[PDB]
């Protein structure tokens, strides 16, 4: 899946 | 850590 | 769709 | 999970 | 109540 | 910490 | 729709 | 309680 | 914008 | 760090 | 439309 | 990579 780190 | 879309 | 954190 | 529909 | 905890 | 639609 | 950090 | 708008 | 601090 | 909706 | 993380 | 796609 797209994902972003945080 | 991760925020992915599903 | 959805918004997981991992 | 840890997860919300957006 | 609908959340994530990050 | 926690991210809630309302 | 509102998403929040509580 | 700050939000975004989606 | 349409930001939150996280 | 923010999260912004774009 | 996207959710970015800066 | 800062973003995603909702
Ligand atoms: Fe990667
Ligand atoms: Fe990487
Ligand atoms: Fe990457």
Do not use: L
Not at chain 2, 1 to 6: F, N, S
């Amino acid at each position: 899946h797209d994902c972003v780190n945080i | 850590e991760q925020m992915c879309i599903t």
